[PDB]
Structure 1
Amino acid sequence: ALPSIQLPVDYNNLFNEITDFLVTFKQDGPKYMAMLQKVANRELNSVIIDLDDILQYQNEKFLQGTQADDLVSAIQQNANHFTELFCRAIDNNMPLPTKEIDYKDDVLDVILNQRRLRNERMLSDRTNELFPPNLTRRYFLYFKPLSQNCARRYRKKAISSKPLSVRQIKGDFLGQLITVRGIITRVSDVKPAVEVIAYTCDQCGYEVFQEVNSRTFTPLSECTSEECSQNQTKGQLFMSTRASKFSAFQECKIQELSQQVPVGHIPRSLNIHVNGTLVRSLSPGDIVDVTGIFLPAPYTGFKALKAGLLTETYLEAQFVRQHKK
């Protein structure tokens, strides 16, 4: 029943290596303290993680010991998993106060602030399992490609970051960061996406947070809360839009530059999803090296036709470098 086979790569101590990568740093105080605190200070959202510095760190951690497991290959090998792993570590080292944060000030921060206030109060009163770490962010982690002038270290084959043809794209690049290039096509207009969307109950309240996973989710009613549940009888609950965390979403297709097309065939477009800060960065008719994790988003059905599963994919945008500023 669903066999298991070990792999040399382990995320446990790699997380540890991420933690040692963050807030302990020299070469550029350190950059990850200031770059993080400026986000904590809420003048900044996008966290641009360069793979270049991850490359710089291993040198200090190898030769120059003590030797450790590799990231730069292990990241781009997966690169989806690190967004949920490499980025959560930031939560553990982040400055708490941090400075002059207040409440309002910001819209919707007061909501959650009062959530945790009433939750703390009511829990500390009841005792006389917590809001998910993804709801409280207000920042986005973006990796960038290593071209690179310093990639000549050399780790050689380590680079993708290979400004490849759309034709060069294979089903063996899915789940691996790949730069691509071409003209922007159709550049669909921005619409809000969704992440948690904690619906509100009625009688006894509380909250529940439904994870937004893949493309879509099924909405639930019943009651999750034990208080409204069974007595009496099932409390009614509705989604509150103010409470939800919205991440900008913009999709756009990119046809090949047509010089990269052989004597035959046809220009082939590739669908690209955008999130957070990188939104609106893209404009129609513009050649751009777009880098991102290359992923499928199945299937929404259909599901009879394929069979299977015939993923059809898309490219998650991560970084954006346009030709001709």
Structure 2
Amino acid sequence: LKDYALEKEKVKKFLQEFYQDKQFKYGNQLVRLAHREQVALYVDLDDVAEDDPELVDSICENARRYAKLFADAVQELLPQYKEREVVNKDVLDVYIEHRLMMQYPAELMRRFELYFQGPSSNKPRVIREVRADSVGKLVTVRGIVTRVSEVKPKMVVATYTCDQCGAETYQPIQSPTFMPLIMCPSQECQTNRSGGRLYLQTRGSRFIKFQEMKMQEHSDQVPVGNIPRSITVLVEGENTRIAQPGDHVSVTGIFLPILLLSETYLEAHRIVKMLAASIAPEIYGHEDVKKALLLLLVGGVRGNINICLMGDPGVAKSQLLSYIDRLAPRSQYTTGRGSSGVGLTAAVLRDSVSGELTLEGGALVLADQGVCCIDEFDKMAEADRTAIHEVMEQQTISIAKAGILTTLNARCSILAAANPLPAALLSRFDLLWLIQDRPDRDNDLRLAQHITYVHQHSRQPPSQFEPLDMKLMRRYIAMCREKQPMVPESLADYITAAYVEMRREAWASKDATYTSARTLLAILRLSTALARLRMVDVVEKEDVNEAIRLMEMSKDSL
């Protein structure tokens, strides 16, 4: 056992004597918190490591008590750093000022939240390995979010007004369900024995945002022959609206039970998210098949792009799709009928909190403003193909069935892989790439040497131009996507001609050709993407020439 007063004093002096970062960060944070210019404060346990490390272990063992102690210490320290009144004060601030002008619960007057960030020395755990030994401790978990609930208010402190007196009664809430009061415990009513009845007030009461979310284990950490396990996380305060379904997240929190069996849950404190044509250096050749993927990732200025690759088996189309899925920030990958029907579009499901029905989207909905990858496209069902066509042409999905009447926005770019032409793919897709294989001794020897080098050294063969990591590519793409070039008026007189003659050539080759305004739109989109790659405000001729060359190369694949 140990007295909490000494540790409270230690926390108070720590919050005031951490200049070793040169600006006094905590002084500024307290000033902003006192002037209502900041509503959240995070404490680093790595910062506490400079002080006595016993506090770190104590916090890791009894996190809630020390969180309350930190909150109390910050509340006591706030008056010292105050300099001025609130510039713009809201309804709650008006109530606080009026109450101070005229005991009150500490959380009622409090208007800030405190959270702990896990130490870097603390190794993250696994959802499967958190058990009774970790109950009440501070843990860090890495996982994937699958379900998120809507934001709703939750009571913190309830305020009651009496029928025959101006006294206000305050009731803290520490349970999922609470019993409202009836009689007035005020001293005036107690003396007079009037027996007045209390009435709840929504304005005086304090509310906080509340959210539910679910997390699952990564497929890498699953043991042999097992199935990933799920955990439930509660979100409150400013941490709300951070996590979204389909994201890989890391959450630091506390493991607590619910009432001799009990059910466990997690309370979140910190949630965090986890030439340039060098896509998949592991694959030899396909030099002209990689710039198209880069342009697809960059996108146009609707400016979406859809790409389909048809090829004989064994040319490794799937690896390119997997690399594209891994590289893109928001991406989804589909293999076939394992995610057909309900896997796409959306479905109606019960709520965890409200107890009513809400709509949860599929792969296409999750991939909104991202890139979707489809493998074995020819094997998909008719309904899925119609939905994909609707997404490609209209960018919205329309659902009208029993209990569902919705229009979902899906602004996603589709990359598809297929085996061996039907007119639908040519008329709908912007770019089709047909990959054919033929035996050549020199090319076979080169490919075999590259494959053997990859298998032996576990790394692609070195060359004059070294490739780049995924983080640098992502940052470069993010920087490139910022700008929006414009097509000059004069170049029209060029581009139109470049179109017309082309169609004339297509009219000469009556065997099998397809041209329309869609080809011109695709050329314009590719030219705009190429101009964006150069950060130029005005599209140049070289971008148009490169786009025309790429389109011709796509067309010349028989």
TM-score range, shorter chain: 0.7 to 0.9
1:319 to 270, 294, 303: 270
Whether 1:82 and 2:66 are equivalent positions in the alignment is: yes
CA RMSD of aligned residues (A): 1.9
Q: Which amino acid aligns with 2:267?
A: E
Does the CA contact (< 8 Å) of 1:229 and 1:235 recur in 2?
no
Number of positions where the alignment pairs a residue of Structure 1 with one of Structure 2: 275
Q: Deviations over 1:13-40 (max 9, x none)?
A: 1112111111123212532211111111
CA distance in 1, matches of 2:255, 2:78: 30
> Equivalences for 1:160-175 in 2 at 5 Å?
162-175=123-136
2:220 to 216, 240, 259: 259
Whether 1:18 and 2:2 are equivalent positions in the alignment is: no
Q: CA deviation at 1:266?
A: 2.2
Does the CA contact (< 8 Å) of 1:37 and 1:95 recur in 2?
no
Unaligned runs of 5+ in 2: 275-328, 330-473, 475-558
1:144 to 117, 139, 162: 117
Q: Deviations over 1:262-311 (max 9, x none)?
A: 1133221111011100001111111111010111232xxxxxxxxx1x22
Unaligned runs of 5+ in 1: 1-6, 59-68, 120-129, 152-158, 299-307
Q: CA deviation at 1:319?
A: 0.5
Does the CA contact (< 8 Å) of 2:44 and 2:118 recur in 1?
yes
User: Hey, which bits of structure 1, 4+ residues long, moved more than 3 A?
Assistant: none
Structure in which a larger fraction of residues adopt strand: 2
Q: Deviations over 1:132-168 (max 9, x none)?
A: 1111121110111122xxx4xxxxxxx2xx2111112
CA distance in 1, matches of 2:6, 2:239: 31
Q: Which amino acid aligns with 1:54?
A: V
CA distance in 2, matches of 1:192, 1:97: 31
Q: Which amino acid aligns with 1:40?
A: A
Whether 1:286 and 2:247 are equivalent positions in the alignment is: yes
Aligned to 1:133: 106
Structure in which a larger fraction of residues adopt helix: 2
Q: Residue 110 of structure 1: SS of its match in structure 2?
A: helix
Does the CA contact (< 8 Å) of 1:174 and 1:295 recur in 2?
yes
> Equivalences for 1:1-325 in 2 at 5 Å?
7=1, 9-28=2-21, 29-58=23-52, 70-96=54-80, 98-102=82-86, 105-117=89-101, 119=102, 130-147=103-120, 151=121, 159=122, 162-229=123-190, 231-298=192-259, 308=260, 310-323=261-274
Q: Deviations over 1:23-81 (max 9, x none)?
A: 123212532211111111212111011111111223xxxxxxxxxx8200110111111
Q: CA deviation at 1:87?
A: 1.7
TM-score, normalized by length of structure 2? 0.47
CA distance in 2, matches of 1:109, 1:201: 23
* Structure with greater contact order relative to length (CA < 8 Å, sep ≥ 6): 1
- The 1:103/1:197 distance shift into structure 2, 3 A limit, reads farther
Q: Residue 185 of structure 1: SS of its match in structure 2?
A: strand
CA distance in 2, matches of 1:18, 1:102: 27
Q: Which amino acid aligns with 2:110?
A: R
Q: Which amino acid aligns with 1:322?
A: K
- The 1:77/1:97 distance shift into structure 2, 3 A limit, reads closer
Query: Between Structure 1 and Structure 2, whose CA radius of gyration is higher?
Result: 2
Q: CA deviation at 1:246?
A: 1.1
Does the CA contact (< 8 Å) of 1:215 and 1:297 recur in 2?
no
Does the CA contact (< 8 Å) of 1:201 and 1:207 recur in 2?
yes
Does the CA contact (< 8 Å) of 1:255 and 1:268 recur in 2?
yes
CA distance in 2, matches of 1:183, 1:267: 11
